[PDB]
Amino acid sequence: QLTEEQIAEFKEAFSLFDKDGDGTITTKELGTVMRSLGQNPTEAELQDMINEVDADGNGTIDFPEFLTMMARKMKDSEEEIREAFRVFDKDGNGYISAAELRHVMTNLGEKLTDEEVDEMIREADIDGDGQVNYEEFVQMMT
Ligand SMILES: [Ca+2]
Ligand SMILES: [Ca+2]
Ligand SMILES: [Ca+2]
Ligand SMILES: [Ca+2]
């Protein structure tokens, strides 16, 4: 179950998508995010992505709809997770480093302290090596 701190973190993630701060994520904003993460969805693809999440059918994603998606996470999806992993593991060595995570967050327009980046890595790190491997990443997502 979600906690206060975790809901507040998902709200911060939502604000990285909601570029114009109007409280909804549009296809355009989703496209911007996806491209900043190295993906190249078409217009129709973006519409399909929003449609999966858009509970009230208004064509945009509000925070309760975003949180509804995040709450459930993934369940028993393989290939999308490897693609997401590769977004972060830009050198391809199989480990997400704090520098790699910070670079991603900077491309999304989030400026974080070193403490904050380390805290993020710590939350997903299981073995304590200070990096996130794929098995760790899968467990975070599911
Ligand atoms: Ca917006
Ligand atoms: Ca909506
Ligand atoms: Ca790496
Ligand atoms: Ca690790």
- Rounded to an integer, what distance in angstroms lies between the CA atom of residue 54 and that of residue 125? 32
Nearest listed ligand to the Cα of residue 64: 2
Output DSSP code: residue 39. -
Buried b (16+ CB within 10 A) or exposed e, 28-67: ebbbbbbeeeeeeeeeeebeebbeebbeeeeebbbbebbb
Coil, helix or strand for 84? helix
63 DSSP β-pair partners: none
Distance from Cα 103 to the centre of ligand 3, integer Å: 11
CATH code: domain of residue 90: 1.10.238.10
Total domains, the chain = 1
Domain extent for 61: 1-142
Nearest of 114, 109, 108, 61 to residue 87 by alpha carbon: 108
| Residues 26, 9 contacting (CB under 8 angstroms) | no
The resolution in Å comes to: 1.6
CA of 27, nearest ligand number = 1
On the CB side of 142, how many CA atoms lie within 13 Å of its CA?
13
Distance CA 63, CA 53 (A): 11
Query: Mapping DSSP to helix (H, G, I), strand (E, B) and coil, where does residue 30 land?
Result: helix
Specify whether the CB–CB gap between 16 and 32 falls below 8 A. Answer: no
Ligand 4 centroid to Cα of residue 95, in Å, is: 8
3-class secondary-structure state, position 8: helix
